[PDB]
């Protein structure tokens, strides 16, 4: 029912700016106060902004105070987050969330309970250039067989991996990318019966939104 | 600021057992008779999910298996029994005042029976090759516990450069972990030597599991 969809994520050089948007649906947007919470690689969640239902009251943590500004367009059911003077520290996954207040035994209280979140929008603040990744197939050296795809030399995160466009879900292992001198690298492996391969195709779909990339390397014997 | 301290940092619990994560606050979160204590559940690759609000209220679609308790500065999340679906990150947030800070987070893992890793070794791809590159990929899949070790031997000698390791999060279906090790070398450095071996050493044995191939 309730659906929040984010967008606007991207790479940005220090001192730059970005404007995240959050599409809301499945509930009367104008009756709730929305928020924005970001998460860094160290997993820690940090509340960053929040606006009132009517969009008159707003507030932020000393963190992004003065550089960020939350806004909303209730007619377009959308939440926005304008970011300026972007430091590298601001690189993280940005989520928007709905807020609900509290009904405590016959009275009402502002609570700020984030009951729904969007999928997130990755934001990286780095001077490094945007590099598409190199997609290399991984087939057996010489009832089941394991295969994989290599994804090296790309920046910044993230990339999305898929096998047979989603047809192959089980037996898949997509590992966290590693950082090597301003260049991430990650692999993915999928195990299937020797009956399906090479009898049937096995291809991985990779994609780097940062550089509008999208390779489909069919693994061959 | 009111910082919350979450303990333990991680946790391993068997299926059906109880998991008890704690959260302690700097100042008092109490007010009007309740406390602005909130727990979230974040499964890898997903946005955190609201579990509890106001100390003990379950979020929508949250089974009674989850419960919150505590008052003042001390609270805890309880999961009994624990099911396959629970391995994840758990944070405790406060909202009694800005900034509304989240706890450090507690990782919850299913404790299961040991399992030996399934090792595979792959030679550089025909492409990466005719590009001046050579990476040898080695997969150590579905094993338990998380702790494992890999060594790379070229023509019979360990190597500690050009290796990249990456562990997956505990799988939800078989509670097993997986690791990926990659040895990256130059095309000529690769054609120079000839026998490449991937060597894993897991608690499920003293004898290392080795896989290899000859550039031949």
């Amino acid at each position: 029912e309730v659906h929040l969809v984010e967008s606007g994520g991207d790479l940005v050089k220090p001192g730059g700016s970005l404007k995240l948007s959050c599409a809301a649906s499945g509930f009367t947007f104008s009756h709730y106060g929305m928020s924005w919470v970001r998460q860094t690689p160290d997993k820690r969640l940090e509340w960053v902004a929040t606006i009132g239902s009517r969009g008159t009251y707003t507030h932020y943590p000393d963190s992004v105070k003065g550089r960020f500004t939350i806004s909303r367009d209730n007619d377009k059911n959308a939440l926005y987050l304008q970011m300026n003077s972007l430091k590298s520290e601001d690189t993280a996954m940005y989520y928007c969330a709905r807020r609900s207040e509290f009904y405590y035994y016959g009275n009402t209280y502002y609570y700020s309970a984030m009951d729904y979140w969007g999928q997130g929008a990755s934001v990286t603040v780095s001077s490094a250039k945007t590099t598409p990744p190199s997609v290399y197939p991984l087939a057996p050296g010489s009832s089941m067989v394991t295969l994989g795809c290599l994804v090296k030399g790309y920046f910044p995160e993230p990339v999305t991996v898929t096998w047979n466009s989603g047809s192959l879900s089980s037996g898949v292992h997509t590992f966290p990318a590693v950082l090597q001198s301003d260049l991430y690298t990650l692999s993915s492996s999928v195990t299937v019966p020797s009956s399906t391969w090479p009898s049937e195709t096995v291809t991985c779909n990779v994609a780097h939104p940062a550089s509008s990339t999208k390779v489909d390397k069919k693994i061959v014997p | 600021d009111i910082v919350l301290t979450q303990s333990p940092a991680s946790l391993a619990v068997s299926l059906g057992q109880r998991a008890t994560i704690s959260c302690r606050a700097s100042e008092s979160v109490d007010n009007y008779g309740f406390s602005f204590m909130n727990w979230f559940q974040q499964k890898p690759g997903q946005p955190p999910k609201l579990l509890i609000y106001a100390i003990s209220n379950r979020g929508s679609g949250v089974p009674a298996r989850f419960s919150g308790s505590g008052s003042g500065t001390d609270f805890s999340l309880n999961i009994h029994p624990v099911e396959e679906d629970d391995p994840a990150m758990y944070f405790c947030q406060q909202t009694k005042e800005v900034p509304w800070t989240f706890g450090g987070g507690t990782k919850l893992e299913i404790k299961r029976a040991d399992a030996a890793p399934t090792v595979s070794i792959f030679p550089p791809s025909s492409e990466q090759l005719t590009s001046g590159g050579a990476s040898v990929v080695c997969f150590l899949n579905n094993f338990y516990p998380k702790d494992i070790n890999v060594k790379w031997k070229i023509d019979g000698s360990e190597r500690q450069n050009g290796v990249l390791n990456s562990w997956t999060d505990q799988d939800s279906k078989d509670s097993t972990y997986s690791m990926s090790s990659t040895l990256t070398l130059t095309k000529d450095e690769y054609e120079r030597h000839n026998s490449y071996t991937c060597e894993a050493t897991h608690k499920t044995s003293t004898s290392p599991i080795v896989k290899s191939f000859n550039r031949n």
């Binding site: 009756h31 239902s53 207040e101 009904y103 016959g106 009402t108 609570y111 | -």
Partner: peptide, 11 residues
């Protein structure tokens, strides 16, 4: 009773 609500149902 205890439950979450919209800022609108607040007043």
């Amino acid at each position: 009773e205890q439950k979450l609500i919209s800022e609108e149902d607040l007043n």
